[PDB]
Subunit: 554 residues, 3 copies
């Protein structure tokens, strides 16, 4: 309440709720994260606003459902995949960094943004962190990917199938069949037809080889503020470089209230580790990455102690969504983390998709060793930090998040989230209703993703499930659950609360009905126009030839 | 004589007469085959009707010289090389399986057929085993080949030279020369000429890469009856899978007279072995394959003993032709077996080409431990088994084979084969005359194959010798031998029997003359029309894309 | 003086003056070369006439500056790089081999020529050793190169950049950009434009792959006299094969005065060694090659002792120019030798480029253990050997070399080289003035090569420095040195001899002025016409197809 503490918000990438020690895992070392939970409050029902990166991060920055800002797609691509695309967090949205910057906070983003970069010109930076309330940025504008690390697979394999391999197999089989029919004297094949087929194969293959050659340097690079500093990105000491930049930022601000958003690349695939962590872990390179990340967190923690800032710094730890079930190396090396008890994971709205770790420590104000089981959202951070900074909330627009501090301080027992809505990109997937004066958590599913292998935990054919069409199965009436009684979501409710369906579904359907009546009519940041590679947007660190390449970090 | 015993005919692929233990080899373990010879009769002059697979097997199935059925080519290709080709054992030919099936035998083929599959439509199966007297088929329609096993060479290298590498070298050298002449100002080369050359190179290379990609799955696959069960064929436990199918067939017929043809893939190249045999042998992976094959034979033998069928089962063991001398890995790893004393081998009519093991066991009727040195043919099985089954011989056509049982039972001392003819595919290579009341074996050569390396045992330039033109050398007068005196064929007769040439060559030339007067005028199953790949004949096990691929065996 | 001794001239390739034991190196074993220096005279200021192979060897053969014979280029290519090019030592030049052959010497060249081969027809051999005074030739017509040994790099990388990789990157980026603009609806791209781009890429790549495939066999091959004997050249026992041919030549001439030029392939890159030398050395495969070369020299030395020819054989040892500083494996493996104290090296006119070992032994006439510090040239051999053979010098043309024997015999104290000129290919680089009755060595630089990495010893961007344009920096006034006081050339003279510049530069500039007034107007053996690959000049040892390939040595 206008006391202006320092604020550090830490976001892991695809860390599952079953990964940290303090959430039940007995073999992953996260001693510094569980230190945070033991010294503070550990949220038990903390819900990301989407099970994919870009929309979850949009909602975290704005305190607003991603559909309110057109940051959720209608197509299969739910996150930005090219740095040189025009979609991004709209210029008229207000982040908590801007709210806090307007109150005199020093603001910095270290690590992953994934909310766009430029719009019309490669230097307008309309969606860049520095245009969205951050005074300093060190990190990457897009995301880590398999493709960013050579010999680690590709997130584009499904796409290569429709657009490259299958057309090229049709052309090739047509050419071989025509040549045989010609040779057997069943068909005169004009050379023009052979020419057309060879020409088409050569064009498809050239485009494909161009994509293979250029994607990593054009899309996997490090920036400081508006400049490229390493292209392609090096994984050498990556996490340590992020740690040093975050520690240095804090040291520049020991007498100035500051806001640090520390947005790790871990543990999104293309897993990696320094020499100090490699090989020595529970579940493969995944474990080394998880606990390299915990090391980095401890380094920041030890800094605040050394600098005597720990008592009046609020620290929040989360991941943007749950771990990715379908993430399996071609050699079967099991990447992706654990969501523990809960079903599903990244890219669906089963509990393992959206229930993420949520830890808050603020030693001066928040009682240590607490545990909040009430439903909270990662959109709640926006109003929490705004009030703490003395920044008024925006009054020209809806804010879906709710201040956490009355709950964190014991002034309140039940959170201000009687209804929450679970979107699958742009499509309303599930409604959550934790009724008042009640303990149960009603959860209806307008649809469910068709898990690709039988009985399997995920959608291993398309690597992620989708939200619409052939990949999904609608349910009428809505398909109801009680998350209070079974977290594992392993039995769909019907015989128990049957004398209650139509009365409680009507109050949940009206909530959705009332809800989608506040959704206005906004540009789609994921339209083809805004998703596709635009040559004039491509940032290219000057090198020899037309090559994009430098290591100004070195 | 209408006693209807069970009948098992076992055919190895390219097993040389110098390979089995019971034929003199002191380092290959064939304990189950030599068991057969010790319990039965071991033929010393058993002669395949051709030194190549397809015609030898045609003659074995029909009891008839391959030229009688148009199953011998005039070109360099002597065996079928594509499953989707229309040549095959003609529909009007009668196999011993059909003769025996018409007497109520249960009939089965396990393993290699190599006598065609379909004619006009991919499902007419006009040449398939089930249309030629077999009630059940488990195996492959074509043959094992180097190309069926990845990283094992190719039988098509000679062909790649004429059709791919040499044209592509001409185009490439023309293009480089033209570019230099253009650049030096000696010749204006229109872009159309460069375009034509590049276009032609691209087309040749695409066709070649298509062949490299598709040949194995389109031609190396397992079938049961009319259905593909594994495509491409897996070599995992291959011989054991064949053993189980053959044992199961016998077990379905313990009270029904049955005919099992067991036609191994061993020891034709693409050699292979289970884990139980790999590495532990005499002469490389060849030895492991030979004695894996002997293991399989012992398993059938032990079955008949367990089931109490051994006493009234006739068993025959042979290979389709002699071992392949010219079969040498690129790394020099010596594949192909041994023909021992005899000269030549697979694809020529020297003794090592056509003299093959021939073992018969029938404990109730055939005295154990016997040894027949009289000339016999692998065409003799057809009338042997027909009489045993009570099936009358076809009387509308010539049968060249002769019942073996009077000889096997000691009722006769000299076989009914005063003259035999040795074809090199469609061309009469050699005449054999074992005169009556005589011991010598006169063998004339109308021509001989030009062994490619000097003094070498085979034709290592084209991998096999041929039967016509540049690869051969005619001889007038016919070039005479006495196989009784030297098996090694190491000295051509002239000074010894010189006062006998013109009198005995005239009686052998009249035999050939009389012989080729019975050869009628028949379709060529090896014409280009019938040898070449026809797209509409291609069996393709349904998979994703246009790919031919399944493992319904699994 | 018409005593007709035998004469052996030994030339290493790129052996630096800091490599032999007898010149100060304490870790390279050259026991047979330093034996030569201990038994004879070791020249301290022996200067190659050029720091590149072809012109240095031209000047050695003719006793004449390379510009006098048009054997120095104006372009970046300073040596012949194709056997099938028409440039070469002009037919009107006279070598010392021809002078000596005309006096009745038996003459032989063993090893590297690098002065051309044929002119208009592949069999005119207008520039071949046998047309330039040698009666016998065993060796290579061009040079050893990285490209002659597979997996050893390429001397053409810079060229691949301008002519292949950069054009192909422009075409590829244009194609990818056009495809994206077309796809985004900003530009209709006609198929003709895509076709043109693909066609151009295919042509560039075909030419490049043709160069990669054909360069080694077409340019790296062994000859005896006018015939190819091994194509491509084998490195197996290469140095030993050269040793045997040189020893055999001597043995054919134990009673006939003979001239042996033994021109090693060592130690030019594509380094190599027999089994007897591999792995056991100071500075890598370079050391093994250097001391394999010393072994070969000892073998010739021991021969003359065995044959009792050592006392009246004059032996000379040198290398054609200094070691190559910029020669570094891609894996950083340090190839190229050491120039010791002196600056620069191969392809520049700093002292390390042109100051080479120079050893003479002639036990009957030359006092052992001597050391000549006077400036001498590798052009001095021509008149030395001519007088020894009784051959008169050519009187229709200038000879720049000067007989060494008055100096070697102690009849004279100062050499006849008051002025020498240091050419960078065709461009006068430096003037050397060792004034008379003086000890200092004045050296002016009209220009200097711009060493590519900062402070680096060489020009590592273009692998060698050049002589003109962007790679060089002119100096007015000429940039003066005193080589007597500092060999390392590490301080440019100005404050010391400042009251002497304009008076001594005017006498050195007049020397150059007077000098270039004797340079006549001659064909350029390095014109594009004479450097470029001509298809009709290509020697091709007959093989299968259009392939150039044989091992008649075997
Ligand atoms: C005629 C139809 C062509 C459509 C091709 C669209 C071009 C796709 O653009 C791709 O985007 C990536 C940029 O990050 C790059 O790696 C590749 O250069 C590029 O091929
Ligand atoms: C300094 C920020 C970028 C300005 C440089 C503009 C030129 C960008 O050049 C880019 O190079 C890429 C591969 O080399 C291509 O794939 C892109 O089409 C091209 O736009
Ligand atoms: C214009 C001249 C073209 C003649 C090419 C003949 C096509 C050869 O057909 C080949 O047969 C095999 C089928 O088993 C396949 O592996 C290949 O698809 C195919 O290229
Ligand atoms: C089920 C028995 C076959 C019916 C399927 C008909 C389609 C066969 O498709 C075949 O695919 C091959 C490679 O994919 C091509 O090389 C052949 O030209 C093509 O005929
Ligand atoms: C239209 C412009 C084309 C110019 C290409 C010049 C051809 C270069 O000639 C090259 O020389 C080498 C001979 O030793 C060979 O290895 C290659 O065959 C050849 O490509
Ligand atoms: C015997 C001396 C040479 C006579 C043979 C003339 C034919 C030379 O053929 C050469 O083959 C090379 C690659 O194969 C090509 O690159 C050359 O353009 C071509 O001229
Ligand atoms: C923080 O609070 C604890 C407990 O009240 C105290 O021991 C510690 O010294 C405080 N640190 C600072 C920097 O005030
Ligand atoms: C703990 O994490 C590992 C991998 O990070 C996972 O395999 C395991 O299932 C997790 N624990 C539980 C109880 O799920
Ligand atoms: C087969 O014959 C042998 C010897 O006559 C006998 O020992 C054996 O029991 C017989 N087997 C059967 C199944 O009749
Ligand atoms: C026995 O077989 C091996 C290979 O199978 C062969 O090398 C050997 O020559 C054979 N024995 C005789 C006597 O030929
Ligand atoms: C060479 O000279 C030395 C010393 O004068 C002598 O010992 C040796 O025998 C001579 N050799 C010949 C071959 O004359
Ligand atoms: C001796 O030679 C080696 C390599 O041949 C070189 O590294 C070293 O510098 C040389 N010695 C001196 C004193 O330069
Ligand atoms: Ca994520
Ligand atoms: Ca065979
Ligand atoms: Ca040199």
């Amino acid at each position: 309440a206008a006391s202006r503490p320092n604020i550090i918000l830490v976001m892991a990438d695809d860390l599952g709720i079953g990964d940290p020690g303090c959430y039940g895992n007995k073999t992953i070392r996260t001693p510094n994260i569980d230190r945070l939970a033991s010294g503070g409050v550990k949220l038990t029902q903390h819900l990301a606003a989407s099970p994919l990166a870009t929309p979850s991060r949009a909602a975290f920055m704005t305190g607003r459902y991603p559909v309110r800002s057109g940051m959720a797609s209608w197509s299969r691509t739910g996150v930005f995949l090219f740095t040189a695309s025009s979609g991004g967090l709209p210029t008229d949205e207000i982040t908590f960094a801007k709210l806090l910057k307007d109150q005199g906070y020093s603001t910095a983003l270290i690590g992953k943004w994934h909310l766009g970069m430029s719009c019309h010109s490669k230097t307008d930076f309309c969606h860049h962190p520095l245009h969205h309330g951050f005074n300093y940025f060190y990190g990457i504008s897009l995301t880590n990917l398999r493709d960013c690390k050579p010999g680690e697979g590709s997130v584009f394999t499904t796409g290569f199938k429709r657009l490259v391999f299958l057309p090229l197999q049709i052309v090739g089989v047509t050419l071989l069949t025509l040549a045989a029919l010609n040779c057997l004297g069943l068909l005169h094949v004009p050379l023009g037809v052979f020419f057309s087929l060879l020409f088409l194969a050569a064009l498809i293959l050239t485009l494909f080889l161009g994509f293979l050659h250029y994607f990593r340097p054009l899309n996997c690079f490090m920036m400081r503020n508006y400049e490229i500093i390493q292209q392609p990105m090096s994984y050498d000491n990556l996490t340590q470089r992020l740690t040093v930049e975050a520690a240095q930022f804090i040291q520049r601000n020991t007498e100035t209230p500051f806001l640090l958003v520390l947005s790790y690349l871990h543990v999104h695939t293309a897993l990696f580790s320094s020499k100090d962590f490699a090989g020595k872990s529970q579940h493969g390179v995944y474990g080394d990455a998880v606990e390299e990340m915990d090391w980095s967190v401890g380094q920041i923690l030890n800094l605040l102690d050394e600098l005597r800032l720990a008592n009046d710094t609020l620290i929040y730890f989360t991941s943007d969504q749950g771990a990715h079930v379908e993430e399996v190396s071609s050699k079967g090396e099991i990447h992706g983390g654990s969501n523990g008890i809960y079903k599903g994971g990244k890219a669906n709205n089963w509990e393992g998709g959206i229930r993420v770790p949520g830890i808050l420590r603020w030693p001066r104000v928040i009682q240590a060793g607490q545990k909040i089981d009430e439903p909270t959202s990662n959109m709640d951070i926006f109003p929490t930090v705004a009030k703490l900074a003395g920044a008024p909330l925006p009054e020209d627009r809806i804010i879906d998040g709710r201040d956490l501090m009355p709950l964190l301080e014991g002034k309140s027992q039940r959170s201000d989230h009687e209804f929450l809505f679970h979107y699958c990109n742009a499509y309303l997937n599930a409604v959550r209703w934790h009724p008042q004066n009640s303990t149960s958590i009603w959860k209806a599913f307008f649809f469910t993703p068709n898990f690709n292998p039988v009985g399997s935990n995920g959608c291993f054919a398309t690597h992620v499930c989708f939200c619409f069409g052939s990949y999904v199965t609608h349910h009428d009436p809505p398909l109801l659950f009680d998350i209070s009684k079974d977290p594992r979501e392993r039995n769909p409710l019907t015989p128990a609360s049957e004398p209650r369906f139509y009365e409680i579904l009507k109050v949940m359907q009206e909530a959705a009905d009332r809800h989608t009546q506040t959704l206005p009519e906004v540009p789609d940041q994921f339209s083809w126009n805004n998703f596709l590679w635009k040559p004039w947007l491509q940032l290219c660190c000057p090198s020899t030839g037309l090559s994009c390449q430098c290591d100004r970090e070195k």
